[PDB]
Design a protein around this nucleic acid. Sequence first.
DNA 1: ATGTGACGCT
DNA 2: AGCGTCAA
Length: 424
Amino acid sequence: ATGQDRVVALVDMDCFFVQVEQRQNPHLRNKPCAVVQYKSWKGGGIIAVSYEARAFGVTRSMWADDAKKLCPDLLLAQVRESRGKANLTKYREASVEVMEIMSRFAVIERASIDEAYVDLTSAVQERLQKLQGQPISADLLPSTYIEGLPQGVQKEGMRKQGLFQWLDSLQIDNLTSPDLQLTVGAVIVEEMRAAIERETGFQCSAGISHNKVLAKLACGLNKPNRQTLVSHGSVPQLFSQMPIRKIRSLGGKLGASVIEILGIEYMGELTQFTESQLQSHFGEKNGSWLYAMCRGIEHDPVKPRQLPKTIGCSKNFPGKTALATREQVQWWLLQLAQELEERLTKDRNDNDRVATQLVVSIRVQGDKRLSSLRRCCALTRYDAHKMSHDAFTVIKNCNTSGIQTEWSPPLTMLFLCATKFSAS
DNA sequence: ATGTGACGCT
DNA sequence: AGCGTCAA
Ligand SMILES: Nc1ccn([C@H]2C[C@H](O)[C@@H](COP(=O)(O)NP(=O)(O)OP(=O)(O)O)O2)c(=O)n1
Ligand SMILES: [Mg+2]
Ligand SMILES: [Mg+2]
């Protein structure tokens, strides 16, 4: 069993927030530029970076003042602020544009604001019947790389050489061949990406493979504005020098313990271990997942879900801005509640659903965790004053200050999240 | 002083 | 229900 039953694609917009700002402001197009939030602390935090600016070393999570040292001509678009908070509505609305287009071709799993997985298995079957044994020509794959080819001068010439080798070895006599299915999947993803660019102006990259992990890895191989086919046969060479941390979900603690417990570096080294061995170190599910994954096999389905299942709104209060008075906490809980309410009302009108749970999270000064404490409470009315009052009720117990007006220990984050949606 | 969404574990 | 991880 080779895990070649499905055709899965991962479409990811290139430097998404930048492209959103570049569409709106033509003077930013074809320039080193980045998107920044809050200009007051070190010129603001960089949150997205055009490929021209990336060539100078500018990255996400950099302060704009430091980015300017690397790239003095860097152009910056600023995130909208509302009620004292960075507001991401323009990017969420642009996300909805691209997802609705992708949804025309197949069912999609929203994986982030700027990417979706798509199960193309059925669409490939139908497209194979319309083709009626007719070969696939290179003109149908004008931006596709075949990973690991060519084998046996300039960028575009080698892409074509690899594509030509792939298409000349293709056995179209068989409508069940997985390589043919992947190839037809890639013809559809070219049309998908052309529709996105035509109808939004936004460019994106894609990976095409047999499962989600390989599709996502494939997408990043030839960014920007290109797509990549990772076939089952290409996995052994691909994985033989692929660091473990590059595989989705292995970029943190679990991947680091794989490396340390097993004494290995690359994904292909995992194949020498039995399934039971991997389960002993990493548990039954992780072990089974690793045993199949290092062979290019994974079964996680593309879930039919185009909409987020939580709706969240948070604000950081770093260092000396931390909230230390009762009245401060109440004012910022109401600012957040008002943003959440307008987001929730729009969600109900657009998507015919209502959240029923409100989760209230806070961070306390001196805690290195994301959240210091989470408490849930009922969400009955999209009313910001009631939501903020309710949110305060369930956290006022955390004020350990003897004086009534002060708040201690001081709060470095407030986080409101509406969840548990039901039809409406 | 980086600044919200999906999921597994218990 | 409350927490931790990974990321996007
Ligand atoms: N930590 C992060 C990751 C992403 N984002 C936002 C900004 C991104 O433009 C957008 C999509 O994230 P992304 O796909 O990981 N990278 P981006 O689309 O900017 O560039 P590519 O590397 O995908 O071409 O989500 C963020 O604000 N904070
Ligand atoms: Mg992207
Ligand atoms: Mg992305």
